[PDB]
Design an enzyme around this catalytic site. Structure first.
Site, PDB file in Angstrom:
ATOM      1  N   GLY A   1       0.800  -1.295  -0.041  1.00 59.27           N
ATOM      2  CA  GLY A   1       0.068   0.055   0.021  1.00 59.27           C
ATOM      3  C   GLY A   1       0.778   1.189   0.093  1.00 59.27           C
ATOM      4  O   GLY A   1       2.124   1.168  -0.004  1.00 59.27           O
ATOM      5  N   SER A   2       0.189   2.386   0.116  1.00 60.61           N
ATOM      6  CA  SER A   2       0.949   3.637  -0.043  1.00 60.61           C
ATOM      7  C   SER A   2       1.815   3.984   0.910  1.00 60.61           C
ATOM      8  O   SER A   2       2.834   4.524   0.934  1.00 60.61           O
ATOM      9  CB  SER A   2      -0.074   4.846  -0.615  1.00 60.61           C
ATOM     10  OG  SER A   2      -0.867   4.960   0.493  1.00 60.61           O
TER      11      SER A   2
ATOM     12  N   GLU B   1       3.376   1.973   2.652  1.00 59.99           N
ATOM     13  CA  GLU B   1       4.440   0.859   2.659  1.00 59.99           C
ATOM     14  C   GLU B   1       5.426   1.158   1.516  1.00 59.99           C
ATOM     15  O   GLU B   1       6.629   0.589   1.479  1.00 59.99           O
ATOM     16  CB  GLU B   1       3.820  -0.496   2.709  1.00 59.99           C
ATOM     17  CG  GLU B   1       3.018  -0.628   3.887  1.00 59.99           C
ATOM     18  CD  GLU B   1       1.617   0.150   3.951  1.00 59.99           C
ATOM     19  OE1 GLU B   1       1.291   0.175   2.725  1.00 59.99           O
ATOM     20  OE2 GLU B   1       1.276   0.257   4.992  1.00 59.99           O
TER      21      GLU B   1
ATOM     22  N   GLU C   1      -5.168  -9.888   3.105  1.00 61.30           N
ATOM     23  CA  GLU C   1      -4.259 -10.076   4.147  1.00 61.30           C
ATOM     24  C   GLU C   1      -4.359 -11.083   4.967  1.00 61.30           C
ATOM     25  O   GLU C   1      -3.690 -11.742   5.541  1.00 61.30           O
ATOM     26  CB  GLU C   1      -4.384  -8.707   4.993  1.00 61.30           C
ATOM     27  CG  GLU C   1      -3.885  -7.603   4.124  1.00 61.30           C
ATOM     28  CD  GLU C   1      -4.795  -6.858   3.135  1.00 61.30           C
ATOM     29  OE1 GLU C   1      -6.191  -7.464   3.460  1.00 61.30           O
ATOM     30  OE2 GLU C   1      -4.529  -5.738   2.673  1.00 61.30           O
TER      31      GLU C   1
ATOM     32  N   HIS D   1      -0.964  -3.070   4.961  1.00 60.45           N
ATOM     33  CA  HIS D   1      -1.211  -1.656   4.638  1.00 60.45           C
ATOM     34  C   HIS D   1      -1.968  -1.096   5.926  1.00 60.45           C
ATOM     35  O   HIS D   1      -3.213  -1.551   5.874  1.00 60.45           O
ATOM     36  CB  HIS D   1      -1.900  -1.594   3.299  1.00 60.45           C
ATOM     37  CG  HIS D   1      -2.475  -0.108   3.382  1.00 60.45           C
ATOM     38  ND1 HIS D   1      -1.381   0.995   3.132  1.00 60.45           N
ATOM     39  CD2 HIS D   1      -3.599   0.274   2.928  1.00 60.45           C
ATOM     40  CE1 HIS D   1      -2.125   2.238   2.812  1.00 60.45           C
ATOM     41  NE2 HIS D   1      -3.632   1.856   2.951  1.00 60.45           N
TER      42      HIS D   1
ATOM     43  N   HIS E   1     -13.120 -28.263  24.129  1.00 65.38           N
ATOM     44  CA  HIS E   1     -13.840 -27.561  22.914  1.00 65.38           C
ATOM     45  C   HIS E   1     -15.510 -27.813  23.316  1.00 65.38           C
ATOM     46  O   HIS E   1     -16.068 -26.784  23.740  1.00 65.38           O
ATOM     47  CB  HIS E   1     -13.685 -28.206  21.590  1.00 65.38           C
ATOM     48  CG  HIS E   1     -14.352 -27.843  20.503  1.00 65.38           C
ATOM     49  ND1 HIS E   1     -14.137 -28.412  19.099  1.00 65.38           N
ATOM     50  CD2 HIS E   1     -15.351 -26.981  20.250  1.00 65.38           C
ATOM     51  CE1 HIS E   1     -14.810 -27.751  18.203  1.00 65.38           C
ATOM     52  NE2 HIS E   1     -15.399 -26.933  18.925  1.00 65.38           N
TER      53      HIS E   1
ATOM     54  N   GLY F   1      -9.217 -22.611  15.433  1.00 72.13           N
ATOM     55  CA  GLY F   1     -10.382 -23.022  15.134  1.00 72.13           C
ATOM     56  C   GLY F   1     -10.890 -22.123  13.934  1.00 72.13           C
ATOM     57  O   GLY F   1     -12.061 -22.224  13.509  1.00 72.13           O
TER      58      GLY F   1
END
Ligand SMILES: Cc1ncc(C[n+]2csc(CCOP(=O)(O)OP(=O)(O)O)c2C)c(N)n1
Ligand SMILES: Cc1ncc(C[n+]2csc(CCOP(=O)(O)OP(=O)(O)O)c2C)c(N)n1
Ligand SMILES: Cc1ncc(C[n+]2csc(CCOP(=O)(O)OP(=O)(O)O)c2C)c(N)n1
Ligand SMILES: [Ca+2]
Ligand SMILES: [Ca+2]
Ligand SMILES: [Ca+2]
Ligand SMILES: [Ca+2]
Ligand SMILES: [Ca+2]
Ligand SMILES: [Ca+2]
Ligand SMILES: [Ca+2]
Ligand SMILES: [Cl-]
Ligand SMILES: [Cl-]
Ligand SMILES: [Cl-]
Ligand code: NA
Ligand code: NA
Ligand code: NA
Lengths: 525, 525, 525
Positions: free
Chosen positions: B24-25, B27, B46, B69, B280, B400
């Protein structure tokens, strides 16, 4: 009554009748016995669930209700929440938690420190201390999302709470009405009106909260009375004014120096329903030039506090726009003259210039179409080339977060079944929330998706070129077949490699009875 | 030197040579002049970027570096970070921030309150107070991700920092070595060894940090000396033991009462490299039966603190497994006998039973295959039917959170180019991170993706059935063509509607030179 | 059993028998039926409650238990928690919450977002999701405070929880033992020992975690074998070595350049149980000079990660000091020679120089006295002039937060009833936690408080003078009569305006049977 029964009654009494969701086991005790008067809209990933709910809330101008699965589902939605925060979208995000007896040991699917997870992108975030408190917490969430400045909120509920007995005093929640429909006191409003009446060369700047308030027509009256040009504040998430009205001057550049230069010579600048300002590029200079003063009307204290210049008034945009529009004098100045139509760019029989695409959409789309923009290198062109006469006609990711428009366009189309939604989305942007297409297919929500395929992250390449930044990796996205992705999720797909094919594809899409994706081959930047 | 130059030198000096990213800009000033000795792996969303980095870090047993970003990109990755937290994955997540001069006004792409955004799913989260501090902050991030207990960390960097001068004292960071390779002191280790030597009927339970430490072979020696059965702790993210070794007893059920019943009659239960326990389902009862005591060795203080029973030792799993394996007596008890092979389930010429799929994978796959599981209703079958002799042979989303296996399988395959990776993923799960397929195609990472298509969220339906929960919405996912999605992202695709076609498709996939997706029609649950 | 009964049983089974507290209504259901085997120590303000508990925990080398009232009581203690964080003090801070039924409405005394309140100054912060979970949460809190690196933790409990039924499986918590008594693996420890044996001019630097571990005598053996000088790391919260041992070189200056200059010519610097380094003044320069390398042994991953130079090993200080002391060779180098005694400063018959005060304390105090320092402009003098032969002989506010020493000196004296505690506290510092004197009087805890009265915040004035900062307000504190404040809280009080009176006052204080405050007129800085 059970917490389940009481909570669905509170929701319907507060006007909520739709759950946007991706289900999970912590949520089954909420979703079971799902009421017949409610509808559930499934999406396949949580950025899509929240994006669809967000477009639905923005277009319907009312809160949308979301149900996600614990931490992982909430986490998958957090990019979507970044946009919802910046657009003031009233979203009630609920997520299921483990049973209270296994939270301490951190069983699988425990949402650890749950209220902290979505921060800082929510107005309010909470997990109740007992099952009987759940309806009260939901009530508090509904009002926190819906009060000005509207925004997303988060409620985490242990799955064992739903079947417990509700507090018998919960009924007092059902019909609560909370108003933030307020305006500046008479004396100070008279002072503001006198300043506007007295201005020699006023300008008006409008942001997204004007369209959220449906204050657009009042702003038209205000601009006509003041004989003032009207701009849209930079990085615009919505369109707050008819784009071919004679006062309209377009989207402001998102730069400090560019905006002060644009406003030079205007003695009073009235900003309504926008941050001051959502700059983007770093374009240092004067915030305002000598001779210009600024007055902001905003629904959001955070916007009023952070502005680097001007006075501000924190109040409801609908109430303030209506009062100003009805109180100001009619100026004897000449009404601004309409901007000319944009020129036709030269177009050969090959790949499409974005300008050609927008001109053709404007030629063929109904006058009450609704557009979404996630074609990041073509935004200026889009704003110049689409006549948007009506409120609720434009949406763009308010935090710049890609993955908004594709799902949001489905939510907007659900909110506005008689207005054709057309989402214009870059080939890069289309991937972030591609699976949202399935929801359009399954529920037959007839959104049209126009994919602008130039093979690259064009806005980033352009920005790299301006920086003279060499050897940046990761800017190209070759080798994506968007007709195949549409087929994968059950959506009719068309391709347009040239203008003849673009016209034919649009004619077919516009007459279709379901969603349609058109992949358009556009020129490389 | 610049902050950019100094930071890439620190990264290469600390063994980092790959950036997993979606650019991104904010970065671009980091990614410009990208060093020739580094490689950049692009993914289209991402959750996919982080999932790929996560599989790469887990399989390589070293930290992986990520660049995203701002807030929206970080937010899209937060479901992936929920898994990385539970698997102790050493991930260095970096995100670009606005230029320091426009943070206060909240320009577009400002990551507000950035360090709070990924909490509580990171060990450490920070934005430096000045450009010259960036290399030190990166050093602190590298060591925080890499020290036991390993885990994800987050660093936010204003884009204007990279071109500033670095502190000339930053060179002292480059070669720092930090060790957490520790074991219990001699006296107390002698006491532990005597307790194990003295046990009449010991049992061993192993978790994912055994496989992360490559302590698997030492655990085999330990189990052989103690003549003890070995189980894998519940909700297993990795496989810590050869699944056809005579001591092996399989995956523990994720229930309180089920586990105490399983351990009944065992006087000393030694747990290594697992939480106690990742339950769980809610299966209330005794944590341990009378006559059983538990000793946990864990690299994570949080695991030792939250266990509801047993003693614990907080130390390095590799060092403790090696010391125990080499210090305990050889018991005179008989070695446990191997579990029998699982039976062949009846299979007609139509849709495939999952058992048939796993048996066929076990018959055809190389002995050093690596499997990933995101086929949630078939996990028990998978564990029974795949002979996994070697370390690093199994990965399952540790929190999970769906959307892990598809991208992670690409990162694992990148980490292990000579071991065939086979990801077994449900039709529901496949959508969450579907766009990761593109990265496999673009870089020709030859992962095989087996999509188990039964048309429904089967584990959820089953759980609803057990709850006798009627009228739950959103459980079915009809109308997805996974061959078309694979074509959309450039991956060769095959379909298997019956066993003949499954065999042929696997033979073709196994001989292919690139990634392959096989859509398998499996029986409805 | 009730949650109340079960929780007190867990506390006594885990070695806790004292509650330091200031009570409130949310806490009455916890404090009622207070067990006969426990003792409650009341203090009149919460900074005092926590300071007393902190000195007690540091001196006893075991966790201390605290009970405070909701948000306001927790908030009054947060400056005390800043020190406890930096000293790794194992404090279990509990606070009462409103009844679960009135949390949502935010009744008076609701601790809103309670777990966030003490962050970032605690290792762990939590409010349980149900009454039956309280004993498990307390167990997790006890182990989180007590595991390395030790530190404060926070538990918030709704007042209605105590009378509810406890989970019958809570008994498995009572006898859990958790060890972090670990050391570097043999191979790498052999490498470290060889590096030390091979050093031509090693130096040793010790921090507070040496004294916390009672590793002092092992560090003496280590320094004698290596024939190495020993310094105390800067900003020292504790004294880790006998201050008249021949190897001892004193307190390091808290400056980057000063420390590298001090270490110049030392080839290997071994730091044990300290951050690297707790600098204070900004004294920029080289972190180490060419020819010096540094190796840190720390119990705290955060210390290892943030060091700007050197290698590090994260392990137990007691276990590592003992192993090193017993494994290194005896060097053939000459043992370092002891530093000379400090000179007597000229002293007339008027106000006392701080040097005179310390020399007189050293002349008269027992050899096993314990000192506390909160006389900020005299720290260097104190370190030079007090012979502290034994462990546990010095405490200074680890975060620099005033208000520590007065209450802590009472907790230390409670922990060490046969060692005379002498707190040396500036007239400014004495006010922050003045009400702690009452607890000394009420419980007859015979701490001696020496108030150094120079009328000003002397360290701040000195620092302003160095900055050439003119016109700084608020530096003077005239007009405080400390004998009257002591009388106010029931503590015997004496004044010393000159050396004759100082000697007589100390003789009387040393023979007293209760606490005594001596106000000493010291020279203006
Ligand atoms: C979630 C997210 N990730 C990354 C970015 C950075 N970003 C801004 S514009 C852009 C490229 C969009 O490309 P595309 O949709 O093809 O449109 P084009 O720029 O080619 O017109 C990217 C990756 C972002 N804004 N949001
Ligand atoms: C990010 C995320 N969203 C939702 C869920 C809830 N969930 C658990 S299993 C499951 C269904 C998975 O379906 P599929 O991959 O088709 O496998 P099957 O259960 O049919 O074997 C769902 C939706 C989750 N675990 N993670
Ligand atoms: C809680 C707190 N408030 C303020 C300060 C700032 N401070 C550091 S030293 C100091 C003065 C201490 O004065 P005194 O105790 O009289 O000792 P002197 O400096 O005169 O030797 C102050 C106010 C602090 N460290 N802690
Ligand atoms: Ca036209
Ligand atoms: Ca593009
Ligand atoms: Ca967060
Ligand atoms: Ca077979
Ligand atoms: Ca399925
Ligand atoms: Ca003397
Ligand atoms: Ca003073
Ligand atoms: Cl009024
Ligand atoms: Cl040892
Ligand atoms: Cl060892
Ligand atoms: Na816990
Ligand atoms: Na701000
Ligand atoms: Na509330």
């Amino acid at each position: 009554a059970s917490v389940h029964g009481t909570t669905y009654e509170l929701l319907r009494r507060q006007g909520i009748d739709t759950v946007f969701g991706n289900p999970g086991s912590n949520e089954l005790p909420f979703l079971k016995d799902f009421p017949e008067d409610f509808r559930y809209i499934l999406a396949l990933q949580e950025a899509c669930v929240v994006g669809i709910a967000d477009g639905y809330a923005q277009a319907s101008r009312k809160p949308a209700f979301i149900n996600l699965h614990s931490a992982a589902g909430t986490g998958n939605a957090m990019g979507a929440l970044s946009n919802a925060w910046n657009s003031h979208s009233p979203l009630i995000v609920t997520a299921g938690q483990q049973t209270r007896a296994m939270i301490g040991v951190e069983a699988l699917l425990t949402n650890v420190d749950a209220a902290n997870l979505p921060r800082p992108l929510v107005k309010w975030s909470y997990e109740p201390a007992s099952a009987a408190e759940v309806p009260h917490a939901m009530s508090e969430a509904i009002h926190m999302a819906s009060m000005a400045p509207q925004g997303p909120v988060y409620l985490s509920v242990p799955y064992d709470d739903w079947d417990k007995d509700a507090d018998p005093q919960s009924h007092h929640l059902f019909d609560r009405h909370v108003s933030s429909s307020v305006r500046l006191n008479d004396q100070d409003l008279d002072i503001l009106v006198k300043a506007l009446n007295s201005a020699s060369n006023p300008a008006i700047v409008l942001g997204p909260d004007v369209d959220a308030a449906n204050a657009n027509a009042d702003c038209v009256m205000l601009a006509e009375r003041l004989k003032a040009p009207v701009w849209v504040a930079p990085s615009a998430p919505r369109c707050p004014f008819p784009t071919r009205h004679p006062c309209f001057r377009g989207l402001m550049p998102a730069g400090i120096a560019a905006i002060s230069q644009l406003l030079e010579g205007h003695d009073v600048v009235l900003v309504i329903g926008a941050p001051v300002f959502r700059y983007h590029q770093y374009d240092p200079g004067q915030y305002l030039k000598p001779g210009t003063r600024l007055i902001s009307v905003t629904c959001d204290p955070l916007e009023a506090a952070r502005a680097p210049m001007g006075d501000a008034i924190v109040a409801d945009i609908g109430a303030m726009a209506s009062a100003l529009a009805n109180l100001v004098e009619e100026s004897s100045r000449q009404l601004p003259t309409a901007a000319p139509e944009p020129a036709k760019v030269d177009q050969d029989a090959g790949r499409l210039h974005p300008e050609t695409v927008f001109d053709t959409l404007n030629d063929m789309a109904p006058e009450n179409a609704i557009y979404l923009n996630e074609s990041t290198s073509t935004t200026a062109q889009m704003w110049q080339r689409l006549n948007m006469r009506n409120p609720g006609s434009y949406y763009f990711c308010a935090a710049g977060g890609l993955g908004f428009a594709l799902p949001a366009a489905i939510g907007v189309q659900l909110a506005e079944p008689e207005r054709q939604v057309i989402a214009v989305i870059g080939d890069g942007s289309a991937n972030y929330s591609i699976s949202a297409l399935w929801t359009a297919a399954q529920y037959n929500i007839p959104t049209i998706f126009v994919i602008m395929n130039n093979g690259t992250y064009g806005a980033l390449r352009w920005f790299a070129g301006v920086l003279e930044a060499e050897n940046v990796p990761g800017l190209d996205v070759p080798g994506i077949d968007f007709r195949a992705l549409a087929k994968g999720y059950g959506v009719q797909a068309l391709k347009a490699d040239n203008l003849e094919q673009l016209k034919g594809s649009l004619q077919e899409a516009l007459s279709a009875k379901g969603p349609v994706l058109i992949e358009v081959s556009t020129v490389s930047p």
